[PDB]
Every structure is written in structure tokens, then in C-alpha cells.
Design a protein around this nucleic acid. Sequence first.
RNA 1: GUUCUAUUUUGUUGGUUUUCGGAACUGAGGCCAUGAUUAAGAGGGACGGCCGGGGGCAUUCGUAUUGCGCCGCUAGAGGUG
Length: 135
Amino acid sequence: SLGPQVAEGENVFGVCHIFASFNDTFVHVTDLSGKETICRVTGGMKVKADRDESSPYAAMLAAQDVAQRCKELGITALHIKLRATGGNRTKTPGPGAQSALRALARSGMKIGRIEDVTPIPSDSTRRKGGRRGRR
RNA sequence: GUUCUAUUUUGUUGGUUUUCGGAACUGAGGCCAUGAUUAAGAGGGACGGCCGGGGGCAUUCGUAUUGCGCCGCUAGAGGUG
Ligand SMILES: [Mg+2]
């Protein structure tokens, strides 16, 4: 909880891994390595109902809690790594991703570079479902 | 040329060998305007440069998965209308 950075000269960089499933949203801030983490709070930790854990309100509260816990240490800027369900399943991020990103941007985390770290397979295994699908 | 032979014939009775004709075999010729229709918008094949997720064998790469090992923080994570 002690920042060695000079205040006006530069900012301390971290990176958030915004995981956006269709049933929950993870907002996870780690360092430049990713091995050491800083703050992780979810939509289910903020809203105690399973059906709206991936809701933009829950992702917004999770992003506000992440930004407050990160300003408690003094990391100022965050790179953004958007991550989806991935694999054989869906590759489009959920509704909480843009809400959490805009929420941390309003709460005051300096936006670095944004990229997709979605685990898009080259050629995956068999998708969970029948030959007729999830009807 | 070789073998066989219907017989006409030597005035009439007999043999042998020829001229002349028919059957088979066999050598040197002369001639054909000498002799093989075209190459199917039929087909087969050779040859040339290709072309192609065609086939078989060996090798190599890519991610994702799931499981394990180590590290960081955590009370939720999955999943559904
Ligand atoms: Mg079924």
C-alpha cells in the first residue's frame, strides 16, 4: 500500500483482464507479469442473485470496487485485456464488459492499450451439445 | 524335269521305249499401275508443359481442451427463463 512513484511525473501501470461470460463478469487487475495480482471482485460478489451476475449493474459495482481498491495502493493506469468465454463456446463478450470498462474509466483509471485475449481456438474439440443442438 | 496313266497308232498276235493328253510332285522365268481406302469434333496409347482439400506412407506445426506442479489474492465459482 506504498507507492514509490513520483506523483506528477509518471503513472504506475497495471492490467485488468475483463472476463465477460454470459452468466458472470470477472474484473481482475494484475501487474505487468500477470503472476502477481492486485484486486479481483466479481458480479456475484456485488449482487446476491445468480441471474443478474453478468448484469451491467453488477459489473459496474465490481469495476468501482476494483478501482477503489486499486487507488488504495496507487496504481494509476491500466491496460485492458478483454476476454470472452472462448474455446469451442461463444467468442462474443457479455453485456458486463463495456459497462465495467466504462465504470473504471469514470472512476478514474487511466486507460492504456485495449486488446482481446479471448481464447479463440485454431481448431478445437467437440462442442458441448448434440448433433441437433441446444434446442 | 520325276512318278502314274484313257489309249488313237506300227495289216492280225507279244515285250520295251518315245510323240501326244489327264492326275501328283517339282525348278528358272514374263506380267499385274502389282497388292495395305481415309484417319471419325469415335476410341486406346506414346509425348510436352501444367493443374488439382484426388489416393497411400512418413514427418512437422498450430491453438484450444482437460489434468498435474509452483506462485499471487480471494468468498464465491459453474449453470439456467
Ligand atoms: Mg441432449
